[PDB]
Structure 1
Amino acid sequence: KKKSLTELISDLKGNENVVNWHEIEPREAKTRPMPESIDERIKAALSKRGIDELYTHQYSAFQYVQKGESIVTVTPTASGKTLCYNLPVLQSIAQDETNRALYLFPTKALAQDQKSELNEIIDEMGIDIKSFTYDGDTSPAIRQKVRKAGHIVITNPDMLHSAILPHHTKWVSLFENLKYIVIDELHTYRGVFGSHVANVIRRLKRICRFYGSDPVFICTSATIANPKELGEQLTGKPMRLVDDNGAPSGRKHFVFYNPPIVNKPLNIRRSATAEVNELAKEFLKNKVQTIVFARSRVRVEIILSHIQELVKKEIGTKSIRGYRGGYLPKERREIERGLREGDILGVVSTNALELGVDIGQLQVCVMTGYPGSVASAWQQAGRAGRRHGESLIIMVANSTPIDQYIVRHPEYFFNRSPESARINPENLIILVDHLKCAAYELPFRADEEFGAMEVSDILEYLQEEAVLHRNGERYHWASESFPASNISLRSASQENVVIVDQSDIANVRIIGEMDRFSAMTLLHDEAIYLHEGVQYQVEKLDWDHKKAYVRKVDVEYYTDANLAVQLKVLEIDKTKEKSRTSLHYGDVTVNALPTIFKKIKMTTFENIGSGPIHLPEEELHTSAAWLEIKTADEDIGEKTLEQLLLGISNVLQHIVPVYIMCDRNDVHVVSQIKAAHTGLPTIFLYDHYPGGIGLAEEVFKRFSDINEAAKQLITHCPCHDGCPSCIGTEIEGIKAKERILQLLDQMS
């Protein structure tokens, strides 16, 4: 016992199950001096916490933005990313106190964090710079003061859409003196949400043009493939990308781990959960600060329970905490603060800590399986690192085909560049909604460009629908309606369910939240809800009022459930037949039958019983485009057919979002071996947004191009048969590429 971190690294270097060891070289801090033009008060205030020099990226950001060139920097929060935009903004306000700035954060909690840091930095100076947040949580009594006195206004894209722009006449103070627009995590604004936010930015730019100000955009993004391009397409201005990371970095060991095989005939490996529990045990017992990511909320709670039980003998009780989005605000702000100050030794988290919140800088990262994407893997890995010491990142794979392929071929992960962020701000639905909003704000002249080109046709269409009216050359708002209130930027999300502890009537308290869709299987009438190790049992799920009345409970087991998802075609309104192929387009419904739930003993993971789930069949009514394979009696084997359809669906999931310029989560591609109406093998592609937003329609239009791009992708990737980047490894035969390509050629 009593080992150090280097001793633990050696014990992992040898005598282990490691399948790859990737060493990331240290980096000495590269710096430039504090600019002379910086206000003396700001230089003294930055002497606090030892910021007498600037990193190369911080200095480069300040210099680019001083000239007026908009920038996007790929700088982690640990490398001093907030200074890259706080320095120019605070400098500009210190020079001329009449200057203002908008900060755009993807969440309200991040806005609060940035306000707090800005308040500290400002208080260290002698200047009276007022910063405020203006979001749905801002009480309306203070909003009047905020519109007037706020030098720095910290908002959401959603609040900007819904509150600030449609009431620009109430914000004249900053729109006339706007110098900087900060966008904190650009990569979150991708896909359909990214399209909405791009149009919101267009409206903000026209508002700023009206008040005679052309602010400069300072953006931050994660390490995606196209940060400069996403920033340019999102803000509509040319961007200067800031690459170099002048922050100091130590040695980093990113290691691949494959759990041992427990039975050789049945060919079954040990759970990544158990190996992760024991690895984090050996690291936490030696007082090494560790983060553990897991793929789901239930598995996060499982790992918390196991780790705390097997570590409290040596470490104690109050050193390991959990983290997931369903936690209360106060509760997880406390968790973040504890991780930052260093008095929380370990944390078991979902992907929620991929967000650039300031939780300090961990020593060890343990991933329970591949996070899902290369970008997520690298961002999860960046949570472990030191200014000068060493750090480990253990990716413990599980039984997934993708995990096992990443294990058996580590060069496939280390050579692949991160994924790309694609938006299409010219989606007809989105562009029409935001054109109505923009016309409500300012009368929209016909020849003035909104983004790329002119858009007089949609203006004429809106005039025809009694919503706009042309006077001279400008289209005025001709409707009694407020458009911004009817348009949600992220209409995927709905109201959440609130978890209410009724354990005693005198201290009834709200303990957490959960999205409505997940509560069907996680909060049903007898489920067990695990809140950071605290056990509750759902007494009753008030589904219509989105409430879950629960009580405190101590049991041996936990609850899990899975949804039986079926898809039905309603009416087929478009179709195209070609030999052994027929591609239809129509309306479909996605039903989720809850069926049953399982009791699983927490300690042994054994099944100890089951139960029923009486909940309404949640259904999505949405447009879809499907292809079915017309076959002769000279058919193919059933299981071979399911494998082939699975491969085609993988290639479609790869190609469709790339060609239609959306995100992988914006469209769902499902496969059926025998559809209900036809009995033929069918692949459906449908956008999950309510009602639909033209993704399936564009897929039906360009499906021939999609199939050709799919064939090209299958032919050109350097794989032996299939990889997760093309058709997948689940195909068992030895001629996977050939069979899939034949089905594609037959699908002309």
Structure 2
Amino acid sequence: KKKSLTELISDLKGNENVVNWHEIEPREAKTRPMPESIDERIKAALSKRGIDELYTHQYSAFQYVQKGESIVTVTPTASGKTLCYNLPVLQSIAQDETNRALYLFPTKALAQDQKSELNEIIDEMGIDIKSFTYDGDTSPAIRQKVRKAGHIVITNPDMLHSAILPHHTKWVSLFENLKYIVIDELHTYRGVFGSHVANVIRRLKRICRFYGSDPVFICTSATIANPKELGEQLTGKPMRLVDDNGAPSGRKHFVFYNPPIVNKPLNIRRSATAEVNELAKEFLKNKVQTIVFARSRVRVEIILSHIQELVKKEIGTKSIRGYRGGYLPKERREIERGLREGDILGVVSTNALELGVDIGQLQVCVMTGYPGSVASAWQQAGRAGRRHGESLIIMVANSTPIDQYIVRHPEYFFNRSPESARINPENLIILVDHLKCAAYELPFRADEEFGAMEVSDILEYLQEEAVLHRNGERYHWASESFPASNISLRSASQENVVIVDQSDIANVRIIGEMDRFSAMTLLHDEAIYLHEGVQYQVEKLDWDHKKAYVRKVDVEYYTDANLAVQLKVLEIDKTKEKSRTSLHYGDVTVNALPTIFKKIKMTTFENIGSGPIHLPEEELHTSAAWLEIKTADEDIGEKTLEQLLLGISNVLQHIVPVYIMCDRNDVHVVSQIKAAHTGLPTIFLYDHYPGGIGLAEEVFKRFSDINEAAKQLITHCPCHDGCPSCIGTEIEGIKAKERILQLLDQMS
């Protein structure tokens, strides 16, 4: 009636729907002694924390930083990440208490957690070293004190952009004695957002070199293929990489699971949801600490409900919690604390827990479908694993062509190294914005470089635009305006819809948040919102004021709605015809229609009703490049053509971010069989950004190279006929690669 973790592994190993088993060997610690040049109080505080010797990567980090070489360390989960930058910083401040340090954290939550850990170690040390967070949530009263009292300042790239750099005169104390700059999640600063952050760091560099201090960069990265490369491109300093993980590891089983078949003629497999519910059932009933990742928020709530209902009989009510970003802050801090301290047995989470928050180590990880990227899969996997014991990671594939491809061909996943991080810090829009901010902070000499090389031409352009005035060889700010306040480092942002519960008007409370775009389908005027298994019904969605008023009624079902997406070219402004195709660049609009939502019983998963959603067709206006296929009378069948269009779309989504150095999400590639304005099959590439940010323009400009590199990728892909790294394994004839390549020929 009680099975151990190893016994449960044995049961899984045999006679199952398992399709692959991958054993990751245990790794015993590799270590060096604590450098006894360290302050004795620091050694004692670390000895209390079980840190008597250092790991190889921690030691290498310390020595590298001690000599002044900038580092980027790839410290996995529970591998002593924090100490790599905490030891140099605390050492150097304990040496000369006039020293200071910047911590750059991608979120405010991680900033608060780092402040907490630093405060604990500082209290154990006994020296009056103050570490403050200066994010947006810092109340304006304490900000003045923090500027001139905080030895360690913990912020965002965002808050570095908007407040610290432009008021560098109010941060004198910090800037004159800046020895270290910590960047905690290098990989999250990629794509266009990384392009912005790069120029933010350039402005930080110029302020530092002005105030008389050249600090050294300590970066932490996830497992991306180019960590040193992204680190150098982002910091602009020579980066030396810390690869060798010297932390203790345990046996790790990484298993591919495929639901059984329930109707072979129609070839429908069981829900990955049901198999995951039952697997987490078996693991949590035996009190095994388990993380269960789900691809969407709704599936997170569904799996939470099912798992809790099936396991409450044996384990209890309060042992299993959910996790998604729309939760309240206090809620998420408590769930993190509970996963850490060991009083939460199971957690069902969105990808929000791929982010390196400290929830400790899990024993079992369950993936309800392939996350969508190799790096995300490996991140979800690294969330489980004891220091010495065993660990198990089950990836229950679903009915996705990509997931079933991983299942039919498991070597494909384990040979692909995780994705690369690409930024273009010389995007015209981004570089111009940040030049304006930098000039506002300090007058910029024309001959002096900004990152790569001289930028005097853009400075002439800026003087022409009444914004800069040129005195001598330096351009001064020539406008009463404040540039950094109207520039958003992640302008693909939004106001969020606040979820308010007017049940009793005596105690009306905010129960959560949700991005405006998602509220169209998850918080419509009769939606059901599930907040950690708690049922609410949206009474009314105030779209204009970003509010969703709900009540706590108890029903049997849950709502799901889908968005019909459209794309309409407004006007073509640049175009180039060819022998068989035509390539245009112009303005397009993407339209999202809420249409109707469906009611589905939670227990049976059967449709029990439908309803309308009366919301506006929300349209995004942006720029796009697109390719029209010219057809004669001798033309391909429509649906063979459509499948070929989908293949070309996949190949383009792979090649374009590589060529124009941006992220895969910075540009979408949509296929249309009969475009509305021409009737001709078309491939659209539009960057999803309110203002056209020039990705589609560069796609149009360098499109021939993109095309031929696409052909190159198709021919040098190791698969038979097709895989999800090229034409996407969903064309329904033989020799699909050849047809795709021929279409690429007619485009070239």
**What's the TM-score, normalizing by structure 1?**
1.00
Q: Structure 1 residue 76: deviation in Å?
A: 2.3
Q: Determine if contact 2:77/2:383 at 8 Å carries over to the other structure.
A: no
Q: Who is 2:170 aligned against? A: 170
Q: Determine if contact 2:161/2:484 at 8 Å carries over to the other structure.
A: yes
Q: Structure 1 residue 49: deviation in Å?
A: 2.1
Q: Determine if contact 2:130/2:149 at 8 Å carries over to the other structure.
A: yes
Q: Determine if contact 1:525/1:539 at 8 Å carries over to the other structure.
A: yes
Q: Who is 2:88 aligned against? A: 88
Q: Secondary structure at the match of 2:544?
A: coil
Q: Secondary structure at the match of 1:45?
A: helix
Q: Who is 1:610 aligned against? A: 610
Q: Secondary structure at the match of 1:306?
A: helix
Q: Structure 1 residue 628: deviation in Å?
A: 1.0
Q: Who is 1:659 aligned against? A: 659
Q: Kindly provide the CA deviation profile for residues 359-392 of structure 1, in whole angstroms up to 9, marking residues without a partner as x.
A: 0100000000000000000010000111000000
| Counterpart-to-counterpart distance in 2, 1:229 and 1:635 | 46
Work out whether 1:531 is the aligned partner of 2:531.
yes
Q: Secondary structure at the match of 1:50?
A: coil
| Counterpart-to-counterpart distance in 1, 2:247 and 2:738 | 49
Q: Structure 1 residue 77: deviation in Å?
A: 4.0
Q: Kindly provide the CA deviation profile for residues 651-671 of structure 1, in whole angstroms up to 9, marking residues without a partner as x.
A: 000000000000000001101
The percentage of aligned residue pairs carrying the same residue is 100
Q: Determine if contact 1:104/1:157 at 8 Å carries over to the other structure.
A: yes
| Counterpart-to-counterpart distance in 1, 2:435 and 2:50 | 48
Q: Who is 1:470 aligned against? A: 470
| Counterpart-to-counterpart distance in 2, 1:638 and 1:531 | 45
Q: Kindly provide the CA deviation profile for residues 581-624 of structure 1, in whole angstroms up to 9, marking residues without a partner as x.
A: 01111000000011000000000000000000000111110000
Q: Structure 1 residue 691: deviation in Å?
A: 1.8
Q: Structure 1 residue 431: deviation in Å?
A: 0.2
Q: Secondary structure at the match of 1:171?
A: helix
CA RMSD of aligned residues (A): 0.5
Q: Determine if contact 1:294/1:369 at 8 Å carries over to the other structure.
A: yes
| Counterpart-to-counterpart distance in 1, 2:525 and 2:469 | 53
| Counterpart-to-counterpart distance in 2, 1:633 and 1:627 | 19
Q: Determine if contact 1:447/1:456 at 8 Å carries over to the other structure.
A: yes
Q: Kindly provide the CA deviation profile for residues 477-500 of structure 1, in whole angstroms up to 9, marking residues without a partner as x.
A: 001100000100000011100000
Q: Kindly provide the CA deviation profile for residues 208-237 of structure 1, in whole angstroms up to 9, marking residues without a partner as x.
A: 000000000000010000000000000000
| Counterpart-to-counterpart distance in 1, 2:638 and 2:323 | 44
| Counterpart-to-counterpart distance in 2, 1:638 and 1:368 | 35
Stretches of structure 1 that go unaligned for 5 or more consecutive residues are none
| Counterpart-to-counterpart distance in 2, 1:379 and 1:7 | 26
| Counterpart-to-counterpart distance in 2, 1:77 and 1:438 | 37
Q: Determine if contact 2:647/2:727 at 8 Å carries over to the other structure.
A: yes
Q: Who is 1:739 aligned against? A: 739
| Counterpart-to-counterpart distance in 1, 2:418 and 2:67 | 31
Q: Secondary structure at the match of 1:109?
A: helix
| Counterpart-to-counterpart distance in 2, 1:174 and 1:594 | 50
After superposing the two structures, state which structure 1 stretch, 571-580 or 129-138, moved more.
571-580
| Counterpart-to-counterpart distance in 2, 1:579 and 1:425 | 36
Work out whether 1:210 is the aligned partner of 2:220.
no
| Counterpart-to-counterpart distance in 2, 1:294 and 1:529 | 17
Q: Secondary structure at the match of 1:362?
A: coil
| Counterpart-to-counterpart distance in 1, 2:566 and 2:633 | 27
Q: Kindly provide the CA deviation profile for residues 82-131 of structure 1, in whole angstroms up to 9, marking residues without a partner as x.
A: 00000000000000000000000000000000000000000001200000
Q: Structure 1 residue 36: deviation in Å?
A: 1.1
Q: Secondary structure at the match of 1:609?
A: strand
Q: Kindly provide the CA deviation profile for residues 526-548 of structure 1, in whole angstroms up to 9, marking residues without a partner as x.
A: 00000000000000000000000
Q: Secondary structure at the match of 1:77?
A: coil
Q: Determine if contact 1:228/1:240 at 8 Å carries over to the other structure.
A: yes
Q: Secondary structure at the match of 1:510?
A: strand
Q: Kindly provide the CA deviation profile for residues 427-466 of structure 1, in whole angstroms up to 9, marking residues without a partner as x.
A: 0000000000000000000010000000000000000000
| Counterpart-to-counterpart distance in 2, 1:676 and 1:163 | 46
Q: Kindly provide the CA deviation profile for residues 465-520 of structure 1, in whole angstroms up to 9, marking residues without a partner as x.
A: 00001100000000110000010000001110000000110010000000000000
Q: Who is 1:680 aligned against? A: 680
Q: Who is 1:390 aligned against? A: 390
Q: Who is 2:285 aligned against? A: 285
| Counterpart-to-counterpart distance in 2, 1:245 and 1:430 | 36
| Counterpart-to-counterpart distance in 2, 1:299 and 1:628 | 38
Q: Who is 1:577 aligned against? A: 577
| Counterpart-to-counterpart distance in 1, 2:101 and 2:49 | 25
Consecutive aligned runs of 4 or more in structure 1 exceeding 3 Å deviation: none
Q: Determine if contact 1:326/1:512 at 8 Å carries over to the other structure.
A: yes
Q: Secondary structure at the match of 1:248?
A: coil
Q: Determine if contact 1:652/1:710 at 8 Å carries over to the other structure.
A: yes
Q: Determine if contact 2:625/2:700 at 8 Å carries over to the other structure.
A: yes
| Counterpart-to-counterpart distance in 2, 1:77 and 1:64 | 22
Q: Determine if contact 2:570/2:588 at 8 Å carries over to the other structure.
A: yes
| Counterpart-to-counterpart distance in 1, 2:228 and 2:696 | 29
Q: Structure 1 residue 580: deviation in Å?
A: 1.6
Size of the aligned set, in residue pairs, is 748
After superposing the two structures, state which structure 1 stretch, 47-56 or 535-544, moved more.
47-56
Q: Secondary structure at the match of 1:15?
A: coil
Matches within 5 A, 1:624-639: 624-639=624-639
Q: Structure 1 residue 637: deviation in Å?
A: 1.2
Q: Kindly provide the CA deviation profile for residues 688-709 of structure 1, in whole angstroms up to 9, marking residues without a partner as x.
A: 1112100010000000000000
| Counterpart-to-counterpart distance in 2, 1:459 and 1:339 | 52
| Counterpart-to-counterpart distance in 1, 2:720 and 2:246 | 40
Q: Determine if contact 1:76/1:356 at 8 Å carries over to the other structure.
A: no
| Counterpart-to-counterpart distance in 1, 2:52 and 2:654 | 47
Q: Kindly provide the CA deviation profile for residues 154-180 of structure 1, in whole angstroms up to 9, marking residues without a partner as x.
A: 000000000000000000001000000
Q: Secondary structure at the match of 1:287?
A: coil
Q: Who is 1:312 aligned against? A: 312
Q: Structure 1 residue 563: deviation in Å?
A: 0.2
Q: Determine if contact 2:100/2:174 at 8 Å carries over to the other structure.
A: yes
**CA gap 1:87/1:190 in 2 versus in 1, 3 angstroms:** same
Q: Who is 2:297 aligned against? A: 297
Q: Who is 2:32 aligned against? A: 32
Q: Structure 1 residue 635: deviation in Å?
A: 1.4
Q: Determine if contact 2:537/2:550 at 8 Å carries over to the other structure.
A: yes
Matches within 5 A, 1:426-441: 426-441=426-441
Q: Determine if contact 1:197/1:234 at 8 Å carries over to the other structure.
A: yes
Q: Determine if contact 1:77/1:357 at 8 Å carries over to the other structure.
A: no
Q: Determine if contact 2:185/2:219 at 8 Å carries over to the other structure.
A: yes
Q: Structure 1 residue 579: deviation in Å?
A: 1.7
| Counterpart-to-counterpart distance in 2, 1:582 and 1:275 | 48
Q: Secondary structure at the match of 1:91?
A: helix
Q: Secondary structure at the match of 1:598?
A: strand
| Counterpart-to-counterpart distance in 2, 1:283 and 1:630 | 57
| Counterpart-to-counterpart distance in 1, 2:718 and 2:321 | 43
Q: Structure 1 residue 646: deviation in Å?
A: 0.1
Q: Determine if contact 2:70/2:217 at 8 Å carries over to the other structure.
A: yes
| Counterpart-to-counterpart distance in 1, 2:181 and 2:162 | 18
Q: Who is 1:648 aligned against? A: 648
| Counterpart-to-counterpart distance in 1, 2:691 and 2:211 | 38
Q: Kindly provide the CA deviation profile for residues 528-584 of structure 1, in whole angstroms up to 9, marking residues without a partner as x.
A: 000000000000000000000000010110000000001100000111111220111
Q: Secondary structure at the match of 1:587?
A: strand
Q: Who is 1:501 aligned against? A: 501
Stretches of structure 2 that go unaligned for 5 or more consecutive residues are none
| Counterpart-to-counterpart distance in 1, 2:37 and 2:208 | 27
Q: Structure 1 residue 724: deviation in Å?
A: 0.6
Q: Structure 1 residue 633: deviation in Å?
A: 1.6
| Counterpart-to-counterpart distance in 2, 1:245 and 1:364 | 22
Q: Secondary structure at the match of 2:411?
A: helix
Q: Determine if contact 1:672/1:682 at 8 Å carries over to the other structure.
A: yes
| Counterpart-to-counterpart distance in 1, 2:730 and 2:615 | 34
Q: Secondary structure at the match of 2:611?
A: strand
**What's the TM-score, normalizing by structure 2?**
1.00
Q: Secondary structure at the match of 1:7?
A: helix
| Counterpart-to-counterpart distance in 2, 1:580 and 1:463 | 45
| Counterpart-to-counterpart distance in 2, 1:550 and 1:136 | 29
Matches within 5 A, 1:578-597: 578-597=578-597
Q: Secondary structure at the match of 2:266?
A: coil
Q: Secondary structure at the match of 2:457?
A: helix
